[PDB]
Amino acid sequence: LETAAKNLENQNKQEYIKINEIDAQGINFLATFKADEKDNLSQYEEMQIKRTIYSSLNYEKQKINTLKEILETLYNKLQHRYTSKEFIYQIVASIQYDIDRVLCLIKEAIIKELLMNLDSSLKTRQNFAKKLNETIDDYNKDSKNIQTNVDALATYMKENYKTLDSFKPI
Amino acid sequence: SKLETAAKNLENQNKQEYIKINEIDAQGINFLATFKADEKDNLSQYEEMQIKRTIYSSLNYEKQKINTLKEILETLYNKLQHRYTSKEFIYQIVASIQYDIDRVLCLIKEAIIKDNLHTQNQKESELLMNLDSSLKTRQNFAKKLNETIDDYNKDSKNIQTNVDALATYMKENYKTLDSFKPI
């Protein structure tokens, strides 16, 4: 348990320094979301999202940029705006948060079913990553017209990121 | 959102704490050596860091005051008679002040995320009160801790010169974790 905390902690710092490296080159990934005055993308929330995304896409700028275009392209159509937001604030944040929650519960133990809870929530982020990479690949091949047609992109994203629980292990 | 801009001030202050601690530690000052070396209680490097979080903050990152504390806890540790007072301070008082604060930030964060889901059950004022509370505890602690570095260096009530005085004093001044909370 101490060893999990130790490893996971070390993973968190490594992600943090990698995210900062990428963002220093001025790729404002969630720029369009930061600019939104309806919700408030807190600095903290911005950061949690990136942990999942950046890690998922193995810190490859080109890929982060490709996804930026999908989120932005749905964002630029009022009809599908909720789809881009729900992805970020509902799926991606929930995948990330869950990992975090267990690590509080692991810390709370060390200082007073957790290892299968930690197992699960890390695994849920592995299955998301895999799905996301397929999606980046699918986009660049304009499969199901999800590059030329934003209606298709909406359908595809809706269908492929329906619920948090679908990325969980069986 | 006050809750969001609470998460932000703890986040960056957490970070700023981390870079100072690692710097002070870099210079070979072995604050928790004696406690790490202990078989009976495994002290994790997280556990250790969190403890430093409350102590090095409270002593304003001044090495002198840290090694004077080091001198106190090791004096207490090496007199078998009084060795558990050294740990209660470390593990039952220090590690309890720090832990309340990180627990609130876990909860503050949950509430922020759950807001975006539309499933926020946590009352937003309760978390801020709890935040404002545990911060104040650690400052009440910090104030006590500098009193105790001053006294030791002046040998007040024979605290430097008699370990039985020192054990009494630390028990008097660091009795319960609630003894530093506001009212």
Numbering used by the authors:
A (entry chain G): 14 to 125, 137 to 194
B (entry chain A): 12 to 194
What does the paper say about this structure?
Two CspA orthologous proteins, BGA71 and BGA66, that are capable of binding complement system components C7, C8, and C9 and thus inhibiting the assembly of the MAC have been identified in B. bavariensis, allowing B. bavariensis to escape the attack by the immune system. The importance of BGA71 and BGA66 in the resistance to the immune system was supported by the gain of resistance to complement-mediated killing after expression of either protein in the serum-sensitive B. garinii strain G132. In conclusion, we have solved the crystal structure of the key complement inhibitory protein BGA71 from B. bavariensis.
All three BGA71 constructs were overexpressed in E. coli, but only BGA7162-251 yielded crystals, suggesting that the flexible region present in the other two constructs interfered with the crystal formation, as previously observed for the BBA66 protein of B. burgdorferi. By surveying the crystal structure of BGA71, we identified cysteine 173 in α-helix D as the residue that forms disulfide bridges, which is responsible for cross-linking of the two monomers. Furthermore, comparative sequence analysis of the PFam54 orthologous proteins reveals that cysteine 173 is not present in any other orthologous PFam54 protein, suggesting that dimerization by cysteine cross-linking is a unique feature of BGA71. The structure of CspA showed the highest similarity to BGA71 among the other PFam54 orthologs of B. burgdorferi, with a Cα root-mean-square deviation of 1.66 Ǻ. While BGA71 did not bind CFH and CFHL-1, an interaction with components C7 and C9 has been demonstrated. However, the lack of binding complement regulators can be explained by the inability of BGA71 to form a homodimer in the same manner as CspA.
